[PDB]
Amino acid sequence: SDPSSINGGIVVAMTGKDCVAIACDLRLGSQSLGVSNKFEKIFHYGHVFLGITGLATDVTTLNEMFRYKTNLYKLKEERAIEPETFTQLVSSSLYERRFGPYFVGPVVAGINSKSGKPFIAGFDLIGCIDEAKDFIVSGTASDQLFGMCESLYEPNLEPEDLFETISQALLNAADRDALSGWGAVVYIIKKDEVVKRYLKMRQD
Amino acid sequence: YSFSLTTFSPSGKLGQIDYALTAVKQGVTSLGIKATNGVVIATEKKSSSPLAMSETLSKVSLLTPDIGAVYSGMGPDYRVLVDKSRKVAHTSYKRIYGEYPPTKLLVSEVAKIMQEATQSGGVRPFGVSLLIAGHDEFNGFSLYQVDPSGSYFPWKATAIGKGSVAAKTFLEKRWNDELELEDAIHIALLTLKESVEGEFNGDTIELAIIGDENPDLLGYTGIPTDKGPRFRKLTSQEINDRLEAL
Amino acid sequence: RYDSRTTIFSPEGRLYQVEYALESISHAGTAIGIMASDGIVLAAERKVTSTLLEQDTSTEKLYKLNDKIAVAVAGLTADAEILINTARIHAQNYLKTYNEDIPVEILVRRLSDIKQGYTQHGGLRPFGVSFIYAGYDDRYGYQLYTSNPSGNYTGWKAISVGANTSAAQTLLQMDYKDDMKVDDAIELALKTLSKTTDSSALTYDRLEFATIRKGANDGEVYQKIFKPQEIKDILVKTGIT
Amino acid sequence: GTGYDLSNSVFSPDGRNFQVEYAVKAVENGTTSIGIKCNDGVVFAVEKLITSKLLVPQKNVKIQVVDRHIGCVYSGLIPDGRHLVNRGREEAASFKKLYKTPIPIPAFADRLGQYVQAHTLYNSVRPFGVSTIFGGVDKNGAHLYMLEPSGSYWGYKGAATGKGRQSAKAELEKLVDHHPEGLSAREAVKQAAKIIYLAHEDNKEKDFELEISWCSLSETNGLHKFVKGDLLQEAIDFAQKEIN
């Protein structure tokens, strides 16, 4: 282990043609002890989905913090935040406390209702826009994911082919990740609706 | 009663608010007309001496490239408050939202600076009522009036200042539900020539628009994915052009 | 004489400044909540209007403070603006800390202190805002309250603030029904608003409307602000237009 | 008139601040202070009235020193003038630490004028009510100012204030006439005394004590010091001789 990611967790975001997906494992760990099988990494505010990897206490704290920040916006402008705009909001929350900083790697996923265009982003510890629209992965299996994703990646798969491609990438990676191995939930996100599908997979 | 910011009146309201309103009425005449692809904003300049440079007065000041303003009321209050407005717009809403703020949101910040200058007694509120027009990709072209009473209202066409009352009926009569920007620019000059005559000319009337994106003003190129300034200030020579064809 | 600052009382144990602050309220338009077990309607009237005042792009006398509690405003809109921001910020603070959308009581009680606080301490002006708080909390169901500018609260089955408080209250309690319908509650608000307001025809554009319901699809709480056209249609039904 | 005093920041319609004019009137009741600038120095003399004949003589001064080279004498209220010199010693001292040199006389003139101006600008303090004549010698030679309670200052060839300003400005006006050249600091010591002696016919009810001080580039090594002993007695004999 490392001090910024003792409690693990993995999130993977891809782009398809006018669709995104995002998926995560559901294992929480604390050192070598696997604690809970149900505990989601990904949370959402309106129509933008966010996974937050890292030291587990800060995932929970920013889940709450972002909800407070998003909802202040929504009520005031009378309209949903968009996943282009939402990028720079993560970047400022993370940078406010550069000294003593949040230990997370959040990954956005989402599709605009003003372009119909998939937007994914990654951020580090004190935050950055990593504005690739290749595919964006974070977590303890960061190394593992960048290769598995790359191999499979063909741009502009149909949504239901995209579900095959991200679920497979995630499952292989997880078996070989020490601090995640249990459960999975995959979000297949479209403009119209958002379908959530839990996998069935091995436990360790 | 009338005569502290602290004292409520028998029928209510603060009087300092009413007196600050009086100040506006001693002002110059500014007016805005919403078209379906723009907002035109217009005002005049005066300075007493003709030995004065007129291109040094600030009264058409862009807050952001997306959002222009005018005032009626105190000249000093304008420069200070434009300065403050800009400063707040980047802190609350360009470091966070990541782009220059919405027309609705920015109008609320401006009202909030006023409001703080009413709460603290012995500190007068600003002498100005501004008109703040802008564009955003959600609520479209928009127009507001933000009063020194710290409240703002959205409007279709409006005028403020001394000549307001004469201008508003011209606006009722001459506004139609579908207009172009070019018919709005001519209606704007026409109405503003009621405010004064004997001195109205293309170098002393300052008129600007918040119309369509202009990449001409963007100043960097080869980036198609962003838009250019909505704002455009028309030069003295343009204002003369429009005044001849009228 | 005693019409000064807030520390000082009148020898009759009246603070003139709370009394005047009440009177501020009836110089901004009528605002009515009527509670029903099917839902709460909040209905409001515009203080004044012109033919080129835009009022179909936004509300400005109906604000959501959160996703289950919303407020109608009557009084100075400047005084209102700061208090709505403070209420809304607190509404989400409660969300962050407990993982529940804030109870109606905790939110009214907070704001009652705040109004009281500006009168009691320092040299600051009291507030001259009446907010009709209409909420849902899973304790008491449906809830109506209203708060005085004085900085206290009472729960209601119907209340009217804003201009023409006495008459608007009288017509409401005259035709009120204990169980009511949501649909009837909307009708009784137009019927009253007609006779109290000195506008010749009662137009959709002089109305804002929002409804808070759990009976428009259960399992969930739905806040439905009426758009201009929905308002425009319901006048027809009641035959004012 | 009535109104626009009772405050010390309130403008009058005439365009003035009344209360600030009433300051000058207090300075007029104060005892006579003069400075005669000289060609290689400055001489400050002051009329110190005798409250009763129980006063200790030459042990109470309205002369105070600032740093080690700048003379100050105030006319107006005695303690107000003290309070303003203490602030001045701290300011001269901060300048001195910061730059590792003694103050210029123009430097001090700027700084003092800001501290008087600060109390005319705010609503919770009474403006000062003292004039303070000061000066000394620097690189750039000798210089003399007189700072009014209004916070106004200019250089002077010669300056007078107090009850005796009527006599004193007139004697100084003869002094420039008889000497446009400068007048040596030595001969100005003997001069300083005569000026006070004639200015003491405006405070004739009481008796006085004459104290002379000086600061001269070549007869005091740039430093301020009290004039005493033989120099001080000669000036007395000079003033006594010509008054009769």
Place this chain on the structure above:
Amino acid sequence: TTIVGVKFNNGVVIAADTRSTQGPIVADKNCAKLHRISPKIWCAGAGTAADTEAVTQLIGSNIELHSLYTSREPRVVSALQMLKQHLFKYQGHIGAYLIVAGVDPTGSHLFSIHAHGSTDVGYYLSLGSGSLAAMAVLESHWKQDLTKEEAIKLASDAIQAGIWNDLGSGSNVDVCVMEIGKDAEYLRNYLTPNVREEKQKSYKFPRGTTAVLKESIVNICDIQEE
């Protein structure tokens, strides 16, 4: 990463590669290393990607605020001094390395600024990981006085050598040309040294090639009365 600047007569060019590495893994293959301070000031980032990104934004808002305030064109010169101050305050606890250059009425200027707050002027600069690999190309091939043409050719050559010898410098070259009294020309992906190699099988398969356990709809919108 690699960043160069080449001063020429009629302006200054700033080039930098698109790849961003955070550890031995590549964060992004394409992501901008030309951040916009003002319409006529541009700069590129090196070091820790987060520190450079934040700083540019922080200083950028201030120089747009300044333009409005001084009611005149944004100086490069304003920007550096303000930025330098900003950098000083952390005492080198912020890990930003930048090359800032621009055109203003004082002319074209090309500056280097370090994390410490050391500041330099040259007529050819570089900073980053791959700075030693580009620096060699500039000193040899540069001479004093150049046209537009030669400057743009020399700038892309330096990054290109950058990619081929430096590990953290990769992918494509993005170039921005700021000439005095003309528009900045943002030429995205001016140069590719090596295009993509494709994968040799199709990896898209039917569904049920990945196992499902439950299928659900999660909310994202408010229902009506239906």
Place this chain on the structure above:
Amino acid sequence: TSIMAVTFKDGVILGADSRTTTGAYIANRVTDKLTRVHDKIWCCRSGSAADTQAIADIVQYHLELYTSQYGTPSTETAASVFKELCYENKDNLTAGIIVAGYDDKNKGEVYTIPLGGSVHKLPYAIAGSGSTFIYGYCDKNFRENMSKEETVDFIKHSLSQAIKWDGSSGGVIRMVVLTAAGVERLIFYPDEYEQL
């Protein structure tokens, strides 16, 4: 990086090595270390390059105020600002700065301000890391109240030995001449001064 300033009869001439090194990497090879803080007052910088720049700009804020309110500053006056700053920022900053200037009434005056910050009036001074290689040649070969040609030749030659014996010293030898004629720049290039 060796810097000097050396008085003579008609003035003082500052000398500086234009090489700036951060490790074995020369960060820049044509960045001079001559910084104007006033018309007749100039400063040489050695030590930590970041630290010295930051001190340097604040001395000018003071001396801007100094010119406007209090008449021109003297060579002495500016050198005191340096001493004050270095001393209070003992543990945050080590600045080796040589302050020198021309007055009319006093001629050229040289003050070295140490790392720790003091002030030391000297007829000739050398500071930095490149300055510990040229001491013995500076003492012997100098004479007071020189003629202008001779003073340049003294500065050029001392700094030429510095380059043989240190690696942080190099570039071109910069000089700023301060005399009553004005401020004059002078430069040499290595092709010339290694034949010495």
Place this chain on the structure above:
Amino acid sequence: GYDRALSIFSPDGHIFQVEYALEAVKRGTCAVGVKGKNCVVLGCERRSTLKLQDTRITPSKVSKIDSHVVLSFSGLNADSRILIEKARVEAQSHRLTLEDPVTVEYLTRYVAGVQQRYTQSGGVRP
């Protein structure tokens, strides 16, 4: 008389602001206390303003500060509302310190304490 302000004393030695404060108490609902020997009963008038007033959610005139001390009020309802909350933070805090529940004798001092404080000062009304 000397009701123009709170801090100035009065020839008559009665601070007017306090006297008028009492007068205000008569506005509000009657409350009565009667002690037994094994009971205290604390009753209050609960005056009904209209028939539209809830009994569902509308506040009672009697408020428990802690789990064995009870409190009624008479006065300005607005003012009572923060007085009851301030009473309560301390009250609970009493257990933080001692690990003893709130003693009635310590509690009266405290409630009199917040009040005394407001009177002593000049930039608050009682």
Place this chain on the structure above:
Amino acid sequence: MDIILGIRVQDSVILASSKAVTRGISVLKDSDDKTRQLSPHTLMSFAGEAGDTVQFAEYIQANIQLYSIREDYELSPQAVSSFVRQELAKSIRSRRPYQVNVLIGGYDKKKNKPELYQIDYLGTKVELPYGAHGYSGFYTFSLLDHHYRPDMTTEEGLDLLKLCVQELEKRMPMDFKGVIVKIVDKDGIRQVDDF
């Protein structure tokens, strides 16, 4: 403290707390609680470093109690747990960090459902039917899957909990010298005497 467990069954929540209080090489007292009521149907056990434990328990106790009086209505266990998580996650960025880890059991009387929430020191809320911190969780988590069923009576949960005490005792050097077993039900919170 030296043993802390939580098992949640059909209609109750069961929590076990260490008796022993180990301070240096001496056990100063062999029969002390390490649990305090938050509410009449919400019970928080605590374990961790000494001194942190005692002042923290009482401080949290004061706050939940104060809310309960304010609203004159008791907060749901779900609420309570998020409150206790928020204090820990703030402390980890503050001057004085805690090492107090908690399990909060509650018989939710609004959802009519038993709930156990494990909360660690750093500040992680997890809903889980099991729970334990220290090196007590590293024995008894494994054990719990087999002998647990999808539900059982509170009596069968008591015996199940006794089995985890027996596992710990054998294989862990730490003494705790019996346990206090407190049950959290719909009718209050009670103590059952257990070996």
Place this chain on the structure above:
Amino acid sequence: AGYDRHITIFSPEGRLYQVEYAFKATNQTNINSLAVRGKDCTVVISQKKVPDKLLDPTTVSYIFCISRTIGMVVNGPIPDARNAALRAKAEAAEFRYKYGYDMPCDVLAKRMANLSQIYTQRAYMRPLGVILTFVSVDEELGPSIYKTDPAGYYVGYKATATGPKQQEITTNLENHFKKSKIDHINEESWEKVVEFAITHMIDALGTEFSKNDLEVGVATKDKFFTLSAENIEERLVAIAEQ
């Protein structure tokens, strides 16, 4: 009736009586200033009225050196004159080290003007009674004159004048610019632009001037200096001689 015993409390016309009594305090030293634009200079010539003979004249001034390229001429009273001069100097200093370049005539005048607004915004300071006029040749605007008023109103100018007899100065200037049909003086060295300002002022007032009775400040390109009495004297016989 309330409403100049307070800074902030408005009249029922929406005027601030107290703030306007500051526009009327600029007559208290009773001097006139003229500053005009040439084609490579900005000139300011204001009276130096040394009333008494007890005064040494060379310390009497209203022209202040603010910065390397910036002067300021004061009309109105001395105590506030000095406060205006330190703040503009203090700000000149701040701008250079913060933003790393010289300070233009606009940037300074706007900042002082905003500052005047702040002083009227609070009721914790007063307005000053001084009129400030900044003179410079700007780095890319060339000749610039910005008048900063006591409220905080500013407008630029081709020519401005200030003082009691300002109206008499104003007609003479207007007629010149009307007839010439340029916004400048086309004299191509500053020594004759200075002569031109002296020329108009003699005619307006009807008074001769002498060495002690004028003060002249000259903003030239990239430098600034205020002229001694003997250099002013050279100018004065240049007028007399044609």
